[PDB]
mmCIF file of all heavy atoms in Angstrom:
data_model
loop_
_atom_site.group_PDB
_atom_site.id
_atom_site.type_symbol
_atom_site.label_atom_id
_atom_site.label_comp_id
_atom_site.label_asym_id
_atom_site.label_seq_id
_atom_site.Cartn_x
_atom_site.Cartn_y
_atom_site.Cartn_z
ATOM 1 N N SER A 1 68.934 146.303 64.478
ATOM 2 C CA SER A 1 67.779 145.978 65.260
ATOM 3 C C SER A 1 67.604 147.006 66.406
ATOM 4 O O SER A 1 66.486 147.450 66.658
ATOM 5 C CB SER A 1 67.870 144.522 65.775
ATOM 6 O OG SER A 1 66.784 144.214 66.681
ATOM 7 N N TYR A 2 68.751 147.339 67.089
ATOM 8 C CA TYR A 2 68.744 148.297 68.142
ATOM 9 C C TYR A 2 68.973 149.730 67.653
ATOM 10 O O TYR A 2 68.439 150.654 68.327
ATOM 11 C CB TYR A 2 69.801 147.909 69.230
ATOM 12 C CG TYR A 2 69.639 146.542 69.913
ATOM 13 C CD1 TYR A 2 70.497 145.500 69.526
ATOM 14 C CD2 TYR A 2 68.644 146.311 70.837
ATOM 15 C CE1 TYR A 2 70.350 144.241 70.183
ATOM 16 C CE2 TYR A 2 68.543 145.079 71.459
ATOM 17 C CZ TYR A 2 69.398 144.025 71.076
ATOM 18 O OH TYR A 2 69.335 142.823 71.638
ATOM 19 N N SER A 3 69.760 150.013 66.672
ATOM 20 C CA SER A 3 70.012 151.363 66.248
ATOM 21 C C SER A 3 70.483 151.538 64.794
ATOM 22 O O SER A 3 71.325 150.766 64.275
ATOM 23 C CB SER A 3 71.124 151.985 67.149
ATOM 24 O OG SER A 3 71.622 153.052 66.724
ATOM 25 N N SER A 4 69.962 152.599 64.186
ATOM 26 C CA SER A 4 70.447 153.047 62.853
ATOM 27 C C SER A 4 71.830 153.783 62.889
ATOM 28 O O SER A 4 72.343 154.188 61.872
ATOM 29 C CB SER A 4 69.410 154.009 62.229
ATOM 30 O OG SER A 4 69.264 155.190 62.985
ATOM 31 N N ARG A 5 72.345 153.971 64.103
ATOM 32 C CA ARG A 5 73.605 154.768 64.327
ATOM 33 C C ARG A 5 74.738 154.191 63.552
ATOM 34 O O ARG A 5 74.931 152.941 63.475
ATOM 35 C CB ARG A 5 73.926 154.775 65.815
ATOM 36 C CG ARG A 5 74.864 155.934 66.298
ATOM 37 C CD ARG A 5 74.644 156.252 67.784
ATOM 38 N NE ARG A 5 75.787 157.001 68.433
ATOM 39 C CZ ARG A 5 75.836 157.388 69.694
ATOM 40 N NH1 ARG A 5 74.806 157.269 70.542
ATOM 41 N NH2 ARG A 5 76.944 158.097 70.109
ATOM 42 N N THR A 6 75.513 155.067 62.914
ATOM 43 C CA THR A 6 76.799 154.662 62.290
ATOM 44 C C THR A 6 77.848 154.484 63.348
ATOM 45 O O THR A 6 78.579 153.476 63.364
ATOM 46 C CB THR A 6 77.210 155.671 61.185
ATOM 47 O OG1 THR A 6 76.305 155.636 60.148
ATOM 48 C CG2 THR A 6 78.685 155.392 60.657
ATOM 49 N N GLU A 7 78.012 155.497 64.256
ATOM 50 C CA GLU A 7 79.083 155.551 65.272
ATOM 51 C C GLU A 7 78.859 154.603 66.422
ATOM 52 O O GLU A 7 77.833 153.832 66.538
ATOM 53 C CB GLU A 7 79.320 156.983 65.733
ATOM 54 C CG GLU A 7 80.324 157.770 64.922
ATOM 55 C CD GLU A 7 81.753 157.313 65.050
ATOM 56 O OE1 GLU A 7 82.470 157.643 65.959
ATOM 57 O OE2 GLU A 7 82.176 156.464 64.130
ATOM 58 N N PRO A 8 79.817 154.466 67.368
ATOM 59 C CA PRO A 8 79.607 153.563 68.568
ATOM 60 C C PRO A 8 78.566 153.965 69.478
ATOM 61 O O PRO A 8 78.442 155.179 69.799
ATOM 62 C CB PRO A 8 80.976 153.513 69.261
ATOM 63 C CG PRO A 8 81.952 153.895 68.199
ATOM 64 C CD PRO A 8 81.225 154.835 67.303
ATOM 65 N N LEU A 9 77.716 153.097 69.957
ATOM 66 C CA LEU A 9 76.639 153.308 70.932
ATOM 67 C C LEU A 9 77.199 153.882 72.254
ATOM 68 O O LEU A 9 78.132 153.310 72.856
ATOM 69 C CB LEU A 9 75.856 152.048 71.229
ATOM 70 C CG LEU A 9 75.235 151.267 70.042
ATOM 71 C CD1 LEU A 9 74.193 150.220 70.601
ATOM 72 C CD2 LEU A 9 74.492 152.110 68.947
ATOM 73 N N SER A 10 76.546 154.985 72.696
ATOM 74 C CA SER A 10 76.973 155.736 73.910
ATOM 75 C C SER A 10 76.376 155.154 75.161
ATOM 76 O O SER A 10 75.485 154.387 75.092
ATOM 77 C CB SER A 10 76.467 157.169 73.755
ATOM 78 O OG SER A 10 75.013 157.241 73.623
ATOM 79 N N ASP A 11 76.991 155.581 76.281
ATOM 80 C CA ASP A 11 76.618 154.989 77.560
ATOM 81 C C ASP A 11 75.137 155.135 77.951
ATOM 82 O O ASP A 11 74.548 154.306 78.656
ATOM 83 C CB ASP A 11 77.517 155.499 78.724
ATOM 84 C CG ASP A 11 78.899 154.936 78.728
ATOM 85 O OD1 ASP A 11 79.103 153.714 78.434
ATOM 86 O OD2 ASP A 11 79.878 155.647 79.010
ATOM 87 N N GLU A 12 74.564 156.276 77.486
ATOM 88 C CA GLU A 12 73.125 156.503 77.777
ATOM 89 C C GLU A 12 72.297 155.471 77.068
ATOM 90 O O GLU A 12 71.412 154.834 77.662
ATOM 91 C CB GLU A 12 72.704 157.940 77.301
ATOM 92 C CG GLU A 12 73.254 159.062 78.152
ATOM 93 C CD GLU A 12 74.746 159.176 78.200
ATOM 94 O OE1 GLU A 12 75.373 159.560 77.139
ATOM 95 O OE2 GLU A 12 75.395 158.819 79.191
ATOM 96 N N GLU A 13 72.668 155.226 75.782
ATOM 97 C CA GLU A 13 71.979 154.212 74.937
ATOM 98 C C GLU A 13 72.339 152.769 75.441
ATOM 99 O O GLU A 13 71.418 151.909 75.352
ATOM 100 C CB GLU A 13 72.333 154.394 73.447
ATOM 101 C CG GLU A 13 71.415 155.345 72.709
ATOM 102 C CD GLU A 13 71.799 155.617 71.262
ATOM 103 O OE1 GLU A 13 73.050 155.732 70.991
ATOM 104 O OE2 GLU A 13 70.849 155.699 70.392
ATOM 105 N N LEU A 14 73.555 152.557 75.855
ATOM 106 C CA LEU A 14 73.988 151.221 76.255
ATOM 107 C C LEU A 14 73.189 150.723 77.468
ATOM 108 O O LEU A 14 72.541 149.571 77.343
ATOM 109 C CB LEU A 14 75.511 151.169 76.558
ATOM 110 C CG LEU A 14 76.433 151.358 75.389
ATOM 111 C CD1 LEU A 14 77.864 151.820 75.755
ATOM 112 C CD2 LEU A 14 76.520 150.056 74.577
ATOM 113 N N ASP A 15 73.039 151.471 78.514
ATOM 114 C CA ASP A 15 72.177 150.970 79.689
ATOM 115 C C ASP A 15 70.668 151.154 79.393
ATOM 116 O O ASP A 15 69.814 150.609 80.208
ATOM 117 C CB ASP A 15 72.670 151.531 81.050
ATOM 118 C CG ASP A 15 72.531 153.020 81.267
ATOM 119 O OD1 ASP A 15 71.739 153.644 80.602
ATOM 120 O OD2 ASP A 15 73.334 153.538 82.071
ATOM 121 N N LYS A 16 70.255 151.827 78.306
ATOM 122 C CA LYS A 16 68.919 151.772 77.792
ATOM 123 C C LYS A 16 68.646 150.345 77.360
ATOM 124 O O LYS A 16 67.600 149.756 77.683
ATOM 125 C CB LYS A 16 68.678 152.736 76.651
ATOM 126 C CG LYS A 16 67.315 153.504 76.670
ATOM 127 C CD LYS A 16 67.437 154.875 76.012
ATOM 128 C CE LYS A 16 66.421 155.871 76.447
ATOM 129 N NZ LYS A 16 66.960 157.292 76.423
ATOM 130 N N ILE A 17 69.607 149.767 76.623
ATOM 131 C CA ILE A 17 69.593 148.389 76.107
ATOM 132 C C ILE A 17 69.429 147.413 77.328
ATOM 133 O O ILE A 17 68.807 146.367 77.211
ATOM 134 C CB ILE A 17 70.750 148.007 75.215
ATOM 135 C CG1 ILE A 17 70.941 149.085 74.120
ATOM 136 C CG2 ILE A 17 70.617 146.566 74.662
ATOM 137 C CD1 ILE A 17 71.181 148.628 72.698
ATOM 138 N N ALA A 18 70.122 147.732 78.405
ATOM 139 C CA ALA A 18 69.942 147.044 79.669
ATOM 140 C C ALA A 18 68.500 147.055 80.233
ATOM 141 O O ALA A 18 67.961 146.043 80.702
ATOM 142 C CB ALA A 18 70.903 147.597 80.749
ATOM 143 N N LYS A 19 67.868 148.222 80.099
ATOM 144 C CA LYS A 19 66.398 148.365 80.546
ATOM 145 C C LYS A 19 65.418 147.592 79.611
ATOM 146 O O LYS A 19 64.449 147.046 80.064
ATOM 147 C CB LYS A 19 65.960 149.849 80.694
ATOM 148 C CG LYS A 19 66.728 150.676 81.736
ATOM 149 C CD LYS A 19 66.469 152.139 81.543
ATOM 150 C CE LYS A 19 67.364 153.024 82.398
ATOM 151 N NZ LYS A 19 67.309 154.440 81.895
ATOM 152 N N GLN A 20 65.763 147.694 78.301
ATOM 153 C CA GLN A 20 64.975 146.953 77.234
ATOM 154 C C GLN A 20 64.942 145.410 77.543
ATOM 155 O O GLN A 20 63.953 144.824 77.560
ATOM 156 C CB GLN A 20 65.620 147.126 75.858
ATOM 157 C CG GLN A 20 65.025 148.171 74.968
ATOM 158 C CD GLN A 20 65.441 148.071 73.498
ATOM 159 O OE1 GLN A 20 65.515 146.974 72.986
ATOM 160 N NE2 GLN A 20 65.757 149.160 72.868
ATOM 161 N N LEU A 21 66.166 144.912 77.786
ATOM 162 C CA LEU A 21 66.374 143.429 77.958
ATOM 163 C C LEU A 21 66.210 142.920 79.388
ATOM 164 O O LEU A 21 66.201 141.677 79.632
ATOM 165 C CB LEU A 21 67.770 143.036 77.438
ATOM 166 C CG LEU A 21 67.921 142.906 75.915
ATOM 167 C CD1 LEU A 21 67.319 144.040 75.046
ATOM 168 C CD2 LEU A 21 69.441 142.851 75.582
ATOM 169 N N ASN A 22 66.152 143.758 80.434
ATOM 170 C CA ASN A 22 66.186 143.402 81.846
ATOM 171 C C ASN A 22 67.507 142.702 82.164
ATOM 172 O O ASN A 22 67.545 141.618 82.850
ATOM 173 C CB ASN A 22 64.868 142.545 82.109
ATOM 174 C CG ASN A 22 64.698 142.326 83.630
ATOM 175 O OD1 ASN A 22 64.800 141.156 84.109
ATOM 176 N ND2 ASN A 22 64.451 143.386 84.368
ATOM 177 N N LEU A 23 68.627 143.205 81.630
ATOM 178 C CA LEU A 23 69.984 142.791 81.959
ATOM 179 C C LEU A 23 70.612 144.006 82.577
ATOM 180 O O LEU A 23 70.032 145.096 82.573
ATOM 181 C CB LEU A 23 70.683 142.367 80.626
ATOM 182 C CG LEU A 23 70.517 140.925 80.123
ATOM 183 C CD1 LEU A 23 69.178 140.278 80.443
ATOM 184 C CD2 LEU A 23 70.798 140.873 78.605
ATOM 185 N N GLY A 24 71.853 143.857 83.080
ATOM 186 C CA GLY A 24 72.689 144.993 83.517
ATOM 187 C C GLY A 24 73.709 145.433 82.515
ATOM 188 O O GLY A 24 73.777 144.846 81.394
ATOM 189 N N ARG A 25 74.458 146.480 82.803
ATOM 190 C CA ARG A 25 75.586 146.942 81.989
ATOM 191 C C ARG A 25 76.674 145.844 81.895
ATOM 192 O O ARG A 25 77.284 145.629 80.848
ATOM 193 C CB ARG A 25 76.274 148.208 82.539
ATOM 194 C CG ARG A 25 75.911 149.544 81.846
ATOM 195 C CD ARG A 25 76.735 149.730 80.561
ATOM 196 N NE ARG A 25 76.447 151.063 80.013
ATOM 197 C CZ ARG A 25 77.176 152.137 80.173
ATOM 198 N N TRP A 26 76.841 145.170 83.013
ATOM 199 C CA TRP A 26 77.541 143.919 83.038
ATOM 200 C C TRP A 26 76.533 142.855 83.553
ATOM 201 O O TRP A 26 75.587 143.158 84.282
ATOM 202 C CB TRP A 26 78.710 144.001 83.957
ATOM 203 C CG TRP A 26 79.713 144.985 83.469
ATOM 204 C CD1 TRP A 26 79.862 146.273 83.800
ATOM 205 C CD2 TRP A 26 80.804 144.686 82.561
ATOM 206 N NE1 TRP A 26 80.950 146.812 83.116
ATOM 207 C CE2 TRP A 26 81.462 145.891 82.355
ATOM 208 C CE3 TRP A 26 81.193 143.541 81.837
ATOM 209 C CZ2 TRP A 26 82.588 145.996 81.494
ATOM 210 C CZ3 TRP A 26 82.281 143.648 81.002
ATOM 211 C CH2 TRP A 26 82.972 144.848 80.842
ATOM 212 N N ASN A 27 76.800 141.607 83.188
ATOM 213 C CA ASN A 27 75.954 140.424 83.590
ATOM 214 C C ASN A 27 76.799 139.170 83.904
ATOM 215 O O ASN A 27 77.559 138.674 83.059
ATOM 216 C CB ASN A 27 74.943 140.146 82.492
ATOM 217 C CG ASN A 27 73.965 141.294 82.248
ATOM 218 O OD1 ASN A 27 72.954 141.341 82.857
ATOM 219 N ND2 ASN A 27 74.368 142.200 81.311
ATOM 220 N N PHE A 28 76.783 138.750 85.145
ATOM 221 C CA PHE A 28 77.551 137.575 85.584
ATOM 222 C C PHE A 28 76.884 136.264 85.388
ATOM 223 O O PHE A 28 75.704 136.078 85.876
ATOM 224 C CB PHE A 28 77.953 137.770 87.062
ATOM 225 C CG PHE A 28 78.820 136.618 87.650
ATOM 226 C CD1 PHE A 28 80.234 136.800 87.565
ATOM 227 C CD2 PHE A 28 78.338 135.545 88.254
ATOM 228 C CE1 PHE A 28 81.055 135.842 88.147
ATOM 229 C CE2 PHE A 28 79.140 134.561 88.810
ATOM 230 C CZ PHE A 28 80.504 134.692 88.714
ATOM 231 N N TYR A 29 77.411 135.350 84.606
ATOM 232 C CA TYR A 29 76.908 134.033 84.413
ATOM 233 C C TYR A 29 77.844 133.041 85.087
ATOM 234 O O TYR A 29 79.098 133.153 84.931
ATOM 235 C CB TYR A 29 76.780 133.719 82.867
ATOM 236 C CG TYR A 29 75.734 134.598 82.200
ATOM 237 C CD1 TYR A 29 76.070 135.889 81.846
ATOM 238 C CD2 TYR A 29 74.406 134.150 81.942
ATOM 239 C CE1 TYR A 29 75.140 136.734 81.224
ATOM 240 C CE2 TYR A 29 73.473 134.965 81.313
ATOM 241 C CZ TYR A 29 73.878 136.267 80.894
ATOM 242 O OH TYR A 29 72.957 137.070 80.335
ATOM 243 N N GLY A 30 77.289 132.061 85.852
ATOM 244 C CA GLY A 30 78.045 131.012 86.549
ATOM 245 C C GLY A 30 77.085 129.902 86.908
ATOM 246 O O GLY A 30 75.893 129.951 86.654
ATOM 247 N N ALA A 31 77.686 128.848 87.516
ATOM 248 C CA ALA A 31 76.877 127.625 87.839
ATOM 249 C C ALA A 31 77.290 126.905 89.110
ATOM 250 O O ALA A 31 78.388 127.158 89.662
ATOM 251 C CB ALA A 31 76.927 126.727 86.596
ATOM 252 N N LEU A 32 76.359 126.035 89.540
ATOM 253 C CA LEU A 32 76.486 125.264 90.786
ATOM 254 C C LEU A 32 76.444 123.757 90.480
ATOM 255 O O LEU A 32 75.570 123.396 89.609
ATOM 256 C CB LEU A 32 75.417 125.650 91.768
ATOM 257 C CG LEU A 32 75.326 127.175 92.146
ATOM 258 C CD1 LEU A 32 74.069 127.463 92.901
ATOM 259 C CD2 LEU A 32 76.547 127.671 92.862
ATOM 260 N N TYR A 33 77.283 122.977 91.107
ATOM 261 C CA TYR A 33 77.526 121.589 90.790
ATOM 262 C C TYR A 33 77.505 120.678 92.008
ATOM 263 O O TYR A 33 78.063 121.066 93.013
ATOM 264 C CB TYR A 33 78.839 121.402 89.946
ATOM 265 C CG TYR A 33 78.869 122.205 88.730
ATOM 266 C CD1 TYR A 33 79.138 123.563 88.765
ATOM 267 C CD2 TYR A 33 78.725 121.563 87.420
ATOM 268 C CE1 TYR A 33 79.241 124.318 87.555
ATOM 269 C CE2 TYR A 33 78.818 122.279 86.246
ATOM 270 C CZ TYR A 33 79.063 123.656 86.334
ATOM 271 O OH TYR A 33 79.173 124.446 85.225
ATOM 272 N N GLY A 34 76.816 119.504 91.933
ATOM 273 C CA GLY A 34 76.790 118.538 92.956
ATOM 274 C C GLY A 34 75.521 118.587 93.843
ATOM 275 O O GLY A 34 74.627 119.340 93.544
ATOM 276 N N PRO A 35 75.478 117.776 94.906
ATOM 277 C CA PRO A 35 74.243 117.581 95.774
ATOM 278 C C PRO A 35 73.502 118.806 96.168
ATOM 279 O O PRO A 35 74.090 119.895 96.365
ATOM 280 C CB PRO A 35 74.748 116.814 96.939
ATOM 281 C CG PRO A 35 75.857 116.028 96.357
ATOM 282 C CD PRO A 35 76.550 116.873 95.299
ATOM 283 N N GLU A 36 72.212 118.627 96.426
ATOM 284 C CA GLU A 36 71.320 119.766 96.796
ATOM 285 C C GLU A 36 71.826 120.574 98.003
ATOM 286 O O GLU A 36 71.940 121.798 97.878
ATOM 287 C CB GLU A 36 69.857 119.241 96.954
ATOM 288 C CG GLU A 36 68.923 120.017 97.891
ATOM 289 C CD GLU A 36 68.809 121.510 97.571
ATOM 290 O OE1 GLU A 36 68.986 121.881 96.395
ATOM 291 O OE2 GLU A 36 68.638 122.268 98.525
ATOM 292 N N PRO A 37 72.116 119.920 99.135
ATOM 293 C CA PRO A 37 72.667 120.646 100.337
ATOM 294 C C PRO A 37 73.895 121.470 100.107
ATOM 295 O O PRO A 37 74.057 122.560 100.744
ATOM 296 C CB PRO A 37 72.902 119.573 101.313
ATOM 297 C CG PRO A 37 71.922 118.535 101.076
ATOM 298 C CD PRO A 37 71.760 118.570 99.560
ATOM 299 N N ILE A 38 74.805 121.061 99.180
ATOM 300 C CA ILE A 38 76.040 121.776 98.922
ATOM 301 C C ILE A 38 75.713 123.014 98.058
ATOM 302 O O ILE A 38 76.046 124.170 98.481
ATOM 303 C CB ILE A 38 77.110 120.864 98.224
ATOM 304 C CG1 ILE A 38 77.554 119.739 99.146
ATOM 305 C CG2 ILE A 38 78.355 121.667 97.864
ATOM 306 C CD1 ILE A 38 78.180 118.594 98.462
ATOM 307 N N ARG A 39 75.050 122.836 96.942
ATOM 308 C CA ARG A 39 74.565 123.896 96.064
ATOM 309 C C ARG A 39 73.812 125.015 96.783
ATOM 310 O O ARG A 39 73.748 126.139 96.366
ATOM 311 C CB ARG A 39 73.678 123.348 94.905
ATOM 312 C CG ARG A 39 74.468 122.581 93.869
ATOM 313 C CD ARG A 39 73.624 122.186 92.674
ATOM 314 N NE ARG A 39 72.508 121.333 93.070
ATOM 315 C CZ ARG A 39 71.185 121.736 93.066
ATOM 316 N NH1 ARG A 39 70.841 122.929 92.701
ATOM 317 N NH2 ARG A 39 70.266 120.897 93.531
ATOM 318 N N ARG A 40 73.052 124.588 97.794
ATOM 319 C CA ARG A 40 72.414 125.558 98.710
ATOM 320 C C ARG A 40 73.394 126.461 99.414
ATOM 321 O O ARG A 40 73.339 127.650 99.256
ATOM 322 C CB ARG A 40 71.574 124.803 99.747
ATOM 323 C CG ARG A 40 70.646 125.711 100.596
ATOM 324 C CD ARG A 40 69.242 125.109 100.889
ATOM 325 N NE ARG A 40 69.276 124.093 101.970
ATOM 326 C CZ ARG A 40 69.352 122.803 101.894
ATOM 327 N NH1 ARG A 40 69.354 122.177 100.698
ATOM 328 N NH2 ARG A 40 69.363 122.064 103.002
ATOM 329 N N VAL A 41 74.388 125.814 100.071
ATOM 330 C CA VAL A 41 75.357 126.543 100.862
ATOM 331 C C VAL A 41 76.241 127.572 100.123
ATOM 332 O O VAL A 41 76.458 128.684 100.536
ATOM 333 C CB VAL A 41 76.250 125.560 101.673
ATOM 334 C CG1 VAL A 41 77.420 126.318 102.397
ATOM 335 C CG2 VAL A 41 75.457 124.867 102.742
ATOM 336 N N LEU A 42 76.681 127.157 98.906
ATOM 337 C CA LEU A 42 77.463 128.034 98.014
ATOM 338 C C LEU A 42 76.619 129.153 97.372
ATOM 339 O O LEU A 42 77.098 130.258 97.266
ATOM 340 C CB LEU A 42 78.083 127.205 96.844
ATOM 341 C CG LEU A 42 78.938 126.017 97.218
ATOM 342 C CD1 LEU A 42 79.571 125.366 95.958
ATOM 343 C CD2 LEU A 42 80.056 126.420 98.180
ATOM 344 N N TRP A 43 75.357 128.821 96.988
ATOM 345 C CA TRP A 43 74.430 129.816 96.503
ATOM 346 C C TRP A 43 74.218 130.977 97.501
ATOM 347 O O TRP A 43 74.441 132.126 97.230
ATOM 348 C CB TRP A 43 73.116 129.093 96.118
ATOM 349 C CG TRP A 43 72.090 130.088 95.609
ATOM 350 C CD1 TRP A 43 70.812 130.282 96.074
ATOM 351 C CD2 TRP A 43 72.231 131.010 94.538
ATOM 352 N NE1 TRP A 43 70.196 131.261 95.345
ATOM 353 C CE2 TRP A 43 71.032 131.734 94.421
ATOM 354 C CE3 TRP A 43 73.288 131.289 93.596
ATOM 355 C CZ2 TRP A 43 70.875 132.738 93.403
ATOM 356 C CZ3 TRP A 43 73.087 132.287 92.652
ATOM 357 C CH2 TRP A 43 71.868 132.977 92.530
#
């Protein structure tokens, strides 16, 4: 879907995929739990 390349995708192409998807080279996923005022303060 992203490439006809046989070999591993290079760094130029890798962060191109970041621009395609509106993601970063790395992407941090996490979550907030409990009452509104607490989740505010930690956020």
Side-chain angles (χ1 to χ4, degrees):
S1 175
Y2 301 105
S3 166
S4 65
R5 200 158 161 175
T6 294
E7 273 292 276
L9 307 193
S10 57
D11 285 323
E12 288 61 73
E13 272 177 320
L14 291 159
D15 66 27
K16 222 150 203 148
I17 311 224
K19 298 165 189 166
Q20 266 195 41
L21 282 43
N22 191 247
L23 276 31
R25 260 277 186 94
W26 297 94
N27 298 269
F28 183 89
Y29 296 78
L32 304 170
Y33 301 76
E36 155 52 30
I38 298 163
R39 290 187 301 107
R40 191 142 79 262
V41 171
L42 305 182
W43 179 237

